[PDB]
Amino acid sequence: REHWATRLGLILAMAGNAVGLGNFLRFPVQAAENGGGAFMIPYIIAFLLVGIPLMWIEWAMGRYGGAQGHGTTPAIFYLLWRNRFAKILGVFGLWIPLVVAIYYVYIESWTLGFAIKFLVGLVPEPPPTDPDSILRPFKEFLYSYIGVPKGDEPILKPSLFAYIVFLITMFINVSILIRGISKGIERFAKIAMPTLFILAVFLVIRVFLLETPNGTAADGLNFLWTPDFEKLKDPGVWIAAVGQIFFTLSLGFGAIITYASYVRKDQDIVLSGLTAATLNEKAEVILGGSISIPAAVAFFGVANAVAIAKAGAFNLGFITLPAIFSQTAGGTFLGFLWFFLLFFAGLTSSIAIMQPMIAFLEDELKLSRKHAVLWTAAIVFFSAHLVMFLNKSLDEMDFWAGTIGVVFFGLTELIIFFWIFGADKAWEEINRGGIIKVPRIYYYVMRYITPAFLAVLLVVWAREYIPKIMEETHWTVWITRFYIIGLFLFLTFLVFLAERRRNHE
Ligand SMILES: CCCCCCCCO[C@@H]1O[C@H](CO)[C@@H](O)[C@H](O)[C@H]1O
Ligand code: NA
Ligand code: NA
């Protein structure tokens, strides 16, 4: 089995797994939609009661499985709980990252396309003033790129450039993954994460210099970091905070587990896992939190910035920020640096969420790495045409896999590892080889607080929010639901074939 070559490479690869589009695009929108500082108290508590403990649990499960030649949850769940229902539940550890990859890599390809166009200066020129006259050319730029519907049909028509850039993006992902763990993912992380950190710090510094008649970047930081204890009673904020914690740390994707399956059986995971988790949170709240929101607040004020965040999920990062930059000398190049930052953040995450399918084809069906990578890329590239051409298919996949799925799977993996496998056996496995020990209080958190916290979350979610999404959406949501359900059945069939191959061997 491949292993990570160095401790630093392991940490930077895991940090690149975590640090992605969720830090720089998702977190600012989630925080702004939910009152800024009102969002941060639940967010911090969720990190301490969910993020950290599940990170350690996923590192432990992966290292445990890797020592027996298994890096994905169908086999690992079965090692922890010899029961054919364990293999079936483990399919979600292939399905969730595959479904997320199907729309994550496409969004990633937008950042590359925008980076290219901004580098070469093929960008809108606002009029030499009214905010709408500045924002509209950049809204039109995005809408022409992804092909937003101009009539009533729920149909997208991406530009030829966007389609080609998606092929290029897929090719870049493949060229890293096909070289493997140490010579591919690890080597790239050592280059990408330093670059990513420098670009982000430079953009924060540039954004901190923004000042208009409507405010300063400081006004944005006060909005994000000022507690509002009245919102501690709103379940929606807690739901939003925990969902972001899952998404930003790659928890419930089966991806941390697969990466940790390449950690040597004796090697520490307590300190390594905490460091990767801590690096992501720094990149999230310090870097991601200090670029988009302060820039938007400085130019428009809190109320307009909040409304911009609510209007869309891509408004802030693809329309508003480049528009703001356009009003400053060298703003087109700053836009390039922003989208180049997003691309590297995205790329280091998309190789991580495609590796589980690769590891399954290698570990369980005994495919060569070459064939495993090429077939995985083929499945993602083909399936992505649904997200490219059907309006709101992206949203449907992000909900079932990237929102509900991750939380459900995090509770599932905790119950399997800490209740069924055994809390004391799980606790020993986490701490074995640790440079540090997990604090004893966290044994009680993992066994009792974390599962109850999530169970309550999922119940209030399913009762007071989800029904709207099962009765109000447009009929085309069933196209995406049908397809991703078919993907689950396809992956279940592959697990079945892996069973019969081991039976026959
Ligand atoms: C979910 C499945 C999505 C497949 C969408 C592929 C649609 C390709 O679209 C085709 O592109 C042509 C290029 O000449 C255009 O004339 C038309 O839009 C269509 O014929
Ligand atoms: Na993240
Ligand atoms: Na990343």
UniProtKB/TrEMBL annotation:
The name this protein goes by in its record: Na(+):neurotransmitter symporter (Snf family)
Main localisation: membrane
Record-linked InterPro entries: Na/ntran_symport (IPR000175), SNS_sf (IPR037272)
UniProt cross-references to PROSITE patterns, sorted A to Z: NA_NEUROTRAN_SYMP_3
Residues annotated as binding phosphocholine 1: R84
Binding site for phosphocholine 2: R84
Annotated CDD domains: LeuT-like_sbd
GO terms classed as biological process: sodium ion transmembrane transport
Transmembrane feature ranges: 8-25, 37-57, 88-107, 160-179, 191-209, 237-262, 283-308, 336-361, 373-393, 399-421, 441-463, 475-498
Bilayer disposition of the protein: Multi-pass membrane protein
Key word Lyase present: no
Keyword terms, alphabetized: Membrane, Transmembrane, Transmembrane helix, Transport
Source species of the chain: Aquifex aeolicus (strain VF5)
